[PDB]
Amino acid sequence: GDAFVGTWKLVSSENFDDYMKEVGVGFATRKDAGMAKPNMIISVNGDLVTIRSESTHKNTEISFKLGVEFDEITADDRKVKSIITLDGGALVQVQKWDGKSTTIKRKRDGDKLVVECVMKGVTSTRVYERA
Amino acid sequence: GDAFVGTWKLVSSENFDDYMKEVGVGFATRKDAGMAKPNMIISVNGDLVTIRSESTHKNTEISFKLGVEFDEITADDRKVKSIITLDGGALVQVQKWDGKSTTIKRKRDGDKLVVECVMKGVTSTRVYERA
């Protein structure tokens, strides 16, 4: 996934609070995660893809290989089973936990990176631009 | 140092082996560090600047604040005292250890990032381009 590599900065976000509420993030956690404009750094070293989210308080990073299931502890402290694939040119991530599942799509749109998170009829869209 | 933020990829290097030899890097270590084209990721979160070097074998990252002295363990296992300042628009880093010292200059040149390392008459130049 060479097209996703780079440092991305959040320039737009919609329905994110509603999305976190839907997945089950507590008001307090949902409050801090919301009151911050993350920095997304994506890099690939060999067959390993690393995605890192940086902010002035909460840092998280995941390392994985495409198509290989892995354990992930999310920003909101959820222990989930993730699988990331490259489908239709986009990185599609599926998080599974407690019989629930949510989809996170990262796609390139021109000079921007769009992240679409869907959970039970709720769609959150985050637009990032290259730093 | 907002102008340095981003993911950089090595596109050129000269006199690096000679430079490492000068600082005192062993042939073996100098061999592996040379047989690799690092990935430089620079980000700033608040007043903290993080510089990370990634490769398929050796990863290193330093976090610091401008003008504040800090301890640094280099890629080649040297324990040095570093200080990074913003002088003339460039990031100037000075590593001190055993009465020795070396200067590392990171400057923006158009769309590229140039890293100049000097040690006792030996100058190594690395040119990186934005990924």
From Swiss-Prot, chains A, B:
The keyword Transport applies. Changing residue 91 to A: Abolishes export from nucleus. The keyword Oxidoreductase does not apply. It comes from the Eukaryota. The modification Phosphotyrosine is found at residue 19. Transmembrane segments: none annotated. Pfam families: Lipocalin. Keywords: Acetylation, Cytoplasm, Lipid-binding, Nucleus, Phosphoprotein, Transport. A motif (Nuclear localization signal) lies at residues 21-31. One of its GO terms (biological process) is cholesterol homeostasis. SUPFAM superfamilies: Lipocalins (SSF50814). Its main location: cytoplasm. GO terms for cellular component: cytoplasm; nucleoplasm; nucleus. A fatty acid binds at residues 126-128. Forms a beta-barrel structure that accommodates the hydrophobic ligand in its interior. Lipid transport protein in adipocytes. Binds both long chain fatty acids and retinoic acid. Delivers long-chain fatty acids and retinoic acid to their cognate receptors in the nucleus. PANTHER family: FATTY ACID BINDING PROTEIN (PTHR11955). Monomer. Homodimer. Interacts with PPARG. Belongs to the calycin superfamily. Fatty-acid binding protein (FABP) family. This is Fatty acid-binding protein, adipocyte. It comes from Mus musculus (Mouse). The gene is Fabp4.
